[PDB]
Write a protein that binds this ligand. Structure first.
Ligand SMILES: [Cu+]
Length: 67
């Protein structure tokens, strides 16, 4: 309503390991944010990219995580 942008441009991911009761691995949990973290690190390194580590970190943290 008024000027509007009903398009955008972003990624189209899908969910992880979950219909179950097992533990998870911090290399493997939130694997969509993990992908995005490690791609930021392929582009520079993690030092340039902690806003990517933090969004991923806190994602894992929900799952009862030592992060
Ligand atoms: Cu892993």
């Amino acid at each position: 309503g008024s000027f509007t942008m009903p398009g955008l441009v972003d990624s189209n991911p899908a969910p992880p390991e979950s219909q179950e009761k097992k533990p998870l691995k911090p290399c493997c949990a939130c694997p969509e944010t993990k992908k995005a973290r490690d791609a930021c690190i392929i582009e520079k390194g993690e030092e340039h990219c902690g806003h990517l580590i933090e969004a991923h970190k806190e994602c894992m943290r929900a799952l009862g995580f030592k992060i």
